[PDB]
Amino acid sequence: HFNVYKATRPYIAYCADCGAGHSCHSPVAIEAVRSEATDGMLKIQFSAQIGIDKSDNHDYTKIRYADGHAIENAVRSSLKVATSGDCFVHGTMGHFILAKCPPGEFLQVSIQDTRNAVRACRIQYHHDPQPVGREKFTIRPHYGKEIPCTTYQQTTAKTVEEIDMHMPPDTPDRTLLSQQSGNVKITVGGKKVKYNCTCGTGNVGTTNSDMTINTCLIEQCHVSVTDHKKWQFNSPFVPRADEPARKGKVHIPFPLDNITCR
Amino acid sequence: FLQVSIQDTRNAVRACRIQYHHDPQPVGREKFTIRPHYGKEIPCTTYQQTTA
């Protein structure tokens, strides 16, 4: 069947603080948190999509994440989501993770890097659940009524939902310029890098292989990997490549459904 | 309170906890919890890592 998560990639966005009070571009940036389920279940949204390995195969243990225009994968274990206490992870698919957290004033998600280094993001969120009914109990009893309530299910059938997707912008880089002696070289690897230089009418246009300048210094030429060929996400932390926009559509998992609470 | 602990030679935890009432309040006129991605810049003071 359709494997829609083949034209999508993890990306790198700007997280407010990475668990230490300092801000840096993390691969596990947190987008909006949705909590319209009565029993108190959250739909946290990553940036680094999970459940699908680097080779675009469904795996229960590998999750993709972006690392400098290069995709790797990390073990699904060590995916820790927490609030004032320590949450419980229910669902896992795509960008979205389901959790039931104790009350608190923030939440963070983190996972080990390829070299086993924690990559965390922390967002301010006032979580305080109130169970359906007229009593503010904590855990379910072994004798009681049944009251209707709503929750997020684990089904991934047709849902009638949308995410806007677009092609990634011209990612800039500077580690690909190497000044040897009065000339620079551009690294390759599949990245059809775009360039713009000021030295002697310069050079406008995109290459696909190595190139030499022979004329000017480093601080005139530039690297702008274009990539394309994969939809990223429509996030406010990463720019667009064109004014009239392109836009796509993907269905989010875990719809909302009726159950009964005790 | 707070406690500090670290393993012995034989991997036995050695601990010590002291009573301490900790309740920080950020500088300014809002008692926010973590820093935003858009705001003002207010001076403060902190301990630096340098050992000069």
Added chain:
Amino acid sequence: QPGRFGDIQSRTVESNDLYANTALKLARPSPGMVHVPYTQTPSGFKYWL
């Protein structure tokens, strides 16, 4: 009115037309960042609840 009951009003649950009034405003981005800051009065339905 913004911030109270019926800030956004839809003539029917399936109706396409929508009237929203929540004092959405945009602010200049900080130097060296890409974030599109904005400010908005919170939902009127939640405060009515």
Added chain:
Amino acid sequence: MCVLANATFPCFQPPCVPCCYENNAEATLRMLEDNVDRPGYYDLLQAALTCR
């Protein structure tokens, strides 16, 4: 009901069948980026990224 340039083909049977993405990824994506307002989008997306 979907259109490509001047094709106007049914969305259920795109002209790229089969392996639309594998043959030409970028062409497939730019194809899907003009049908977002067409009601027959999803069935096109079903066919576009499906082949054995």
Added chain:
Amino acid sequence: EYKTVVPSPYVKCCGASECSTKEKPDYQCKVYTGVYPFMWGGAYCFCDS
């Protein structure tokens, strides 16, 4: 309850962009001049200001 939709910003390297009006509920659009954004590996839009 409402839901604020914020599409990704459009940064024009070495140029100027013009705002266009649309028929959307509570639409807001503005253009800011003199930005010098940054990304993870380096700051694109070579033009200084």
